[PDB]
C-alpha cells in the first residue's frame, strides 16, 4: 500500500477497504491502465463533431487534425481550456462570497457579518474606495460591488489583478496585453478562441492562456479577501491532522469542498448543538476538515484536518464518519457510492454540484443556521445508527501549527522590527540564513505515491535553508507528515533557517520556533503568498522575477491547479510541476512554456517528475535569482 | 468525388486538388480513420491530470472514471462544455457588435452608424428603454449598454431571453430554473460545474446545459439585433452562389468567418477602389462570401456566395482567389497552408483569431476604412502576381433569392392582410396548404457527403407542403443546389405550398412565387426564426411546443451548432440532428435528450443519421403537433 500512499493512516485504511471489497481511487486507476497516450501527450481534439481527431506523436498518419489543426494548435487549445475551467472554479467561489457579503450588509442574511473590519478598510483603500465618514456596511457594499464588477468588461481592467501586483509587474503584463478585462469575459474568450476554426497560432493561444490565468489569480485573491472580511483573517493556531482526529464516541462530521460559506456556519452551529448530540449518546459534534474547506476552518478556527485530496475516501472507510458535508470542487463522486457500505450520510448543498445517490440539502445564506441544523441532525441520526458497531480509526495524527496569513507573518516579523517588518526577512535572505522562498501548492494525484513528491522536495529545500510555505493539499501533505510541528525544526531545517524560525518564534513569546513549513491556507489562499512576495518585491524595489522565490505544484491534478501554475509563471516565478500536463505532444508548446516565456514574464515552468531532481532544479532556480541580485549562494 | 460532396463544383475542384497533390479536409478525414470510439461515444474524460479516463461502452474494465465519474456524468459534462463553447462563440460575436455600436454613437468610429432607425426603436421598446423625446444616439447608447449588461449578473435576468420568447414559454423555463442570469456567467458556471469533483448528477448537469443554451440563444438574438441596427435589416435580394461566381478577370476577394463588422466595410470600400483595381488590369474587385460572414453580406447586399463550410478550401483550389479575409469561427486553419500552393493571400483581422503563416492586419473599428484599403491592396497585389496564369473556375452557379428577415416575411405576408399579416400564414397552416415549418440550420460535416442530408430531407418536406426556412450552411447547402431559385418551385414544392408561395409572391408584385426555401440568414440569424415562430405562437395564443414547427441540424459539426440544437429543444421544438454527438455511451443521457426532456420543455432531440428516415420522423413530429391542435394531417 506504500506504492499508493506514503501516509501510514491511509495505508491502514487501504488494507481495510481491500479486505471488505470496497473499490478505491487507486483500484479505479489500476483498472484504467494503460491510459490513452494521445490524451496523455495532448494530441487529441474533440472540439467539433468531425472529431475525435488524434495525432501520432511519432511516425505516420494521422499527422494533423481534420480541419488542419496542427499538433501545436491542438495542445495549446486544450491547455487553454484547462486554464479557463480552473479560472471558472476559483472565480465561482469568489463570486459566491461576493454575493454573500452583499446579502449580509443589505440585511438579508443575519448569519453573516463583517467580522474583519480592518481587512475591509484595507481592501477598500487598495481599490480606491473611500472610507472616511462612511458606514462599514456601505464600504462593504462598495467592495462587494467592485468584486462583482471585475467579472465583466468595464472602464477599468480587473482590479483584483492591477491593484495586487507591483506596478512594474503590471506594466510588463500590460505591454504584452496580458491584463484581464473581466474574469468571466476572459473565460468566455478562451472558450471562443479555442473552438473550431478560430485561433490557430500557438503563441497567440498561449498568450490568451496567460491572461486567463491572471483572471484565475484575481478570483483567488478576491476569494481570500472576501472570506477574511466575512469570517476573519487567520492568525496562528494549533490543531491536529490525519485520520486519528476522528473520535469513535462523537458525531464525526467532515466539511469537504472549497467554499466555507456554509462550513464556517457548521462550525459555529455544531457547538450550539452539543447537548442535542449528547442526548444521542455522543460526546458531542466532532467537526473535521477534508480538502480546502477543511483548510479554511483549520486556518480560522483550528478545526483538525482529517485527510485530503486523493485519500478522501479513506475517512469513510474508518466506519466512524457520520456525515460528509459537500459544497463543490475536488469531491470524488465515488463517495456517494462508498457511503452505501460505510454508513456515512453524504450531503450536497450547492445547486450546481449534486451527486447521484447523495442527499441534497438546499443551502441558502438567508437560512444558513436552519440549514446547518437540518444537516447536523441527519449526522446525529447516523451516529445513532452505528451505536454498537466497531470502527477502525487509525491511531495516527500529527500536531499542526497553522494560521499564517500574510498579515500574521508580517505581524510575527514586526516583533523583530516594528516599523519595517519585512526587513528582518530580507536581511536573512541577504546574509544567506534564508536561501529563498518556495511555495508548495496544488493537489495530490493518483499517478504519484501520495505525498512523496511534496515531502521529498520539502526535506531537501529545508536542509538548504529555504523558507517553505504551503497551501491546499500541498499544505495537507506536509501537515500530515509532521512538517507543521515545531518539534521537528531540529530534524528538518538547516542551521540558518532554524536560526530565523527560532528568532521569530521566540520574539512572539513562543519559547520555541515557528513550524518548519508555514501553512498559508486554502487553494485560493495562494493569493496570500502573492501578497507576501509582492510586499517583498515592493520593499526591495524589484519585480517578482528578480526575487529568489519559486513555486512547486509537486503532485497536481485539477484544472484549478493548472491555472495556478500558469499564473505563477505569468507573475514571474520559476514554477515546478511534478505531473506532466498534456503538452509533450508539441515541442514548440513545451519550449514556450519551459523556455521562451522567460522573455515575456520572467517566470517559466520546470517540468520534473523525479522529486530529488526537482529539488535540485528548484534550488538551482533560487540560486540563479540570488546571483542576479549579486548575493552569495 | 461524389462520396465526398454532392456539389458538382466541389467535385471538380477535388479532382484538381488530387492531381496537384494538395491535401484536403476529406484527405485528412481519411487519414484519421478509424476514429477513436471512446471519443465518438463520449466515454472519455480529460478534465484532470489523473486522466485521461475512458469507459468501455460494453464489456469489462474500465467501467468508471478514476475519480468515480460514471458514464452518464462523463457524457453530460462533455456535452455541457460543448454548449458553453458554442455560447462563447455566438456571444463573443454579439459582444463585439455591442462595443462597435457603443463606439459609433460615442463618435469614436465614423465608419459605423445607426443605419436601421426603425429596428433600433423597436428593440428599445422590447427592452423597455424609453424612446419618447430621446436622441437616437442616446437610445442606441442605452441599447448597447443593455446588451453588455446581459453578459453578467444584475437585477434582471438575460433580457435577450426573457423579452424575445412568449410569456408562457418564459414561465415554463423559470419554473425549472432555466432562465440564464448572465451570458458569460452561465458559460463560466458550466466550466466550473463540469470540472473535476463538482456536479456529478446527469439530470442536474443537463439542466445547466439547457440554461447555457439559452445564453447562446441570447447571444444569437443580440448579434442579429445589433447587426441590423448597424448595417440594415435584410430585405429580399437576388444574387448567385457556388464557385462560378468567381471571375478570372477580377480581383476575387472572399470574406470568411462570422462577424461582418469588417466585411460590411470591405463591401462598401471595395466599390470605392474599383479604379485602383482597374489600373492593376482587373475589371474591378469581386467580393464573394464564404460561411456566415458571406451570408451576412449576401443578406444585406446581395454579395454572391462562393462556398461554405467543409468545402471552403475549394475556392482557393481554383487558382483565382486573390484574398481570403478572415475574422473568426469555422475557418479551417489548413487554408494558411494551402495558400502557399494556390497563391491566395490569407488575412486574419481579429486579435484572438490568428493562423500561423497567414498575414495579420490589425483591424480597429476606429480605422476600419484605412484597414480595408490596406487589405484590398494586398489583394490587388496578389491579382497582379497571377497575371498570365490559367485558372480553373467551375462554370457552375445557381440563382439565389434571399434576404428573408422576419420583418421582410411579415411585410410580404402583409400584402395579403395588412392589419393581421400573420393570419394568412396561419390560415394556410390550418387548411393544410402549409403542413408545418422546418428550419434547417448548422454546418456541413466531413462525415456526411456534403449537402446530402439537407437536400434529401428538404426535397421530401417540400413535397409534403412544409414551409422550409434555412440559415448558415444549411442555407448554403440549399442555395448551392437551387432551392432558393423560384424557377424550381414547380419541380420541388407540393401543390398546397406552391399555391401559398405563389399567392405571396404575386401580391409582392413579383409575377412569380417566393423561392422554395426562405433564406433567413447567418447562424446568429437563427434568432430570426425564433422571432417568427414566437410571433406565430403569440398570434395563436399557444406556446412553441404546440406549434407544427421543427428544426433540423442535418449535418452539424461546430460547438455553436450543438448549442443551437440544444436551445431549439429548450424553447420547445422537435430538433433533428443528422450527426451523432458524443452521447451514445450513456443510455440515461440519450433517454433524457430524446425522450424525457419532452416533460420539461416540450421539445426533444430526434437522432437520425439516415436522411430519408429523418424526413419521415420530422413529418411525423409536425403531424403530431397538427393533431394536438385538432387539425387534419
Ligand atoms: S476542431 Fe479540428 S482537430 Fe478538433 S475535432 Fe474538429 S476537425 Fe478535429
Ligand atoms: S475528472 Fe475524473 S473521469 Fe475526468 S480525467 Fe479526472 S479522474 Fe478521470
Ligand atoms: S484518443 Fe484518447 S484522449 Fe482522445
Ligand atoms: S480515448 Fe480517444 S477521445 Fe479519449
From Swiss-Prot, chains A, B:
It comes from the Bacteria. [Ni-4Fe-5S] cluster binds at residues 258, 292, 330, 443, 473, 523. InterPro entries: CO_DH_a-bundle (IPR016101), CODH (IPR010047), HCP/CODH (IPR004137), Prismane-like_a/b-sand (IPR016099), Prismane-like_sf (IPR011254). This is Carbon monoxide dehydrogenase 2. GO terms for biological process: generation of precursor metabolites and energy; response to hydrogen peroxide. It comes from Carboxydothermus hydrogenoformans (strain ATCC BAA-161 / DSM 6008 / Z-2901). One of its GO terms (molecular function) is anaerobic carbon-monoxide dehydrogenase activity. It is a peripheral membrane protein. Belongs to the Ni-containing carbon monoxide dehydrogenase family. Its cofactor is [4Fe-4S] cluster; [Ni-4Fe-5S] cluster.
Amino acid at each position: 500500500q506504500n506504492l499508493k500512499s506514503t501516509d501510514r493512516a491511509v495505508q491502514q485504511m487501504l488494507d481495510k477497504a481491500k479486505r471488505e471489497g470496497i473499490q478505491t481511487v487507486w483500484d479505479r486507476y489500476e483498472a484504467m491502465k494503460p491510459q490513452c497516450g494521445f490524451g496523455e501527450t495532448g494530441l487529441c481534439c474533440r472540439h467539433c463533431l468531425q472529431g475525435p481527431c488524434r495525432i501520432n506523436p511519432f511516425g505516420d498518419e494521422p499527422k494533423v487534425g481534420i480541419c488542419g489543426a496542427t499538433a501545436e494548435v491542438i495542445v495549446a487549445r486544450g491547455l487553454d481550456r484547462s486554464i479557463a475551467a480552473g479560472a471558472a472554479g476559483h472565480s465561482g467561489h469568489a463570486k459566491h462570497l461576493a454575493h454573500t457579503l452583499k446579502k449580509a450588509v443589505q440585511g438579508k442574511a443575519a448569519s453573516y457579518m463583517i467580522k474583519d473590519r480592518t481587512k475591509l478598510h484595507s481592501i477598500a483603500k487598495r481599490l480606491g474606495i473611500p472610507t472616511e465618514g462612511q458606514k462599514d456596511e456601505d464600504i462593504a457594499l462598495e467592495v462587494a460591488k467592485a468584486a462583482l464588477a471585475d467579472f465583466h468588461e468595464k472602464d477599468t481592467p480587473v482590479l483584483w489583478v492591477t491593484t495586487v501586483l507591483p506596478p512594474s509587474r503590471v506594466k510588463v503584463l500590460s505591454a504584452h496585453g496580458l491584463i484581464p478585462a473581466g474574469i468571466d469575459h476572459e473565460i468566455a474568450e478562451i472558450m471562443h478562441r479555442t473552438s473550431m476554426g478560430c485561433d490557430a497560432d500557438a503563441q497567440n493561444l498561449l498568450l490568451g492562456g496567460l491572461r486567463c490565468s491572471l483572471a484565475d489569480l484575481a478570483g483567488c485573491y478576491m476569494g481570500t479577501d472576501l472570506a477574511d472580511i466575512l469570517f476573519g483573517t487567520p492568525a496562528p493556531v494549533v490543531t491536529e491532522s490525519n485520520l486519528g482526529v476522528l473520535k469513535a464516541d462523537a458525531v464525526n462530521v467532515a466539511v469537504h469542498g472549497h467554499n466555507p460559506v456554509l462550513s464556517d456556519i457548521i462550525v459555529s452551529v455544531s457547538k450550539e448543538m452539543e447537548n442535542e448530540a449528547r442526548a444521542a449518546g455522543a460526546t458531542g459534534i466532532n467537526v473535521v476538515g477534508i480538502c480546502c474547506t477543511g483548510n479554511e476552518v483549520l486556518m480560522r478556527h483550528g478545526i483538525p484536518a482529517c485527510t485530503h485530496s486523493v485519500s478522501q475516501e479513506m475517512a469513510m472507510i474508518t466506519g466512524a464518519l457520520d456525515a460528509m458535508i459537500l459544497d463543490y470542487q475536488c469531491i470524488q463522486p465515488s463517495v456517494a457510492t462508498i457511503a452505501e457500505c460505510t454508513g456515512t450520510t453524504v450531503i450536497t448543498t450547492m445547486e450546481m454540484s449534486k451527486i447521484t445517490g447523495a442527499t441534497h440539502v438546499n443551502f441558502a445564506e438567508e437560512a444558513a443556521v436552519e440549514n446547518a441544523k437540518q444537516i447536523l441532525r441527519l449526522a446525529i441520526d447516523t451516529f445513532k445508527r452505528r451505536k454498537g458497531k466497531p470502527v477502525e480509526i487509525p491511531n495516527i495524527k500529527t500536531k499542526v501549527v497553522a494560521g499564517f496569513s500574510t498579515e500574521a507573518i508580517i505581524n510575527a516579523l514586526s516583533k523583530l522590527n516594528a516599523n519595517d517588518p519585512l526587513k528582518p526577512l530580507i536581511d536573512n535572505v541577504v546574509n544567506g540564513n534564508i536561501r529563498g522562498v518556495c511555495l508548495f501548492a496544488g493537489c495530490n494525484n493518483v499517478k504519484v505515491p501520495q505525498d512523496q513528491n511534496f515531502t521529498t522536495i520539502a526535506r531537501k529545500l529545508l536542509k538548504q535553508n529555504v523558507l517553505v510555505v504551503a497551501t491546499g493539499c500541498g499544505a495537507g501533505a506536509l501537515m500530515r507528515h509532521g512538517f507543521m510541528d515545531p518539534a521537528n525544526v531540529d530534524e528538518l531545517c538547516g542551521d540558518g533557517l532554524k536560526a530565523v524560525l527560532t528568532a521569530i518564534g521566540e520574539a512572539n513569546g513562543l519559547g520555541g520556533p515557528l513550524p518548519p513549513v508555514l501553512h498559508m491556507g486554502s487553494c485560493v489562499d495562494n493569493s496570500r503568498a502573492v501578497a507576501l512576495v509582492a510586499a517583498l518585491a515592493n520593499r526591495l524595489g524589484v519585480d517578482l522575477d528578480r526575487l529568489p522565490v519559486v513555486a512547486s505544484a509537486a503532485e497536481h491534478m485539477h484544472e484549478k491547479a493548472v491555472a495556478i501554475g500558469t499564473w505563477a509563471v505569468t507573475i514571474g516565478l520559476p514554477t515546478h510541476i511534478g505531473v506532466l500536463p498534456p503538452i509533450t505532444g508539441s515541442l514548440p508548446v513545451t519550449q514556450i512554456l519551459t523556455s521562451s516565456v522567460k522573455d515575456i514574464t520572467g517566470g517559466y515552468f520546470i517540468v520534473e517528475l523525479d522529486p530529488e531532481t526537482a529539488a535540485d532544479k528548484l534550488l538551482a532556480a533560487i540560486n540563479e535569482r540570488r546571483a542576479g541580485l549579486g548575493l552569495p549562494w
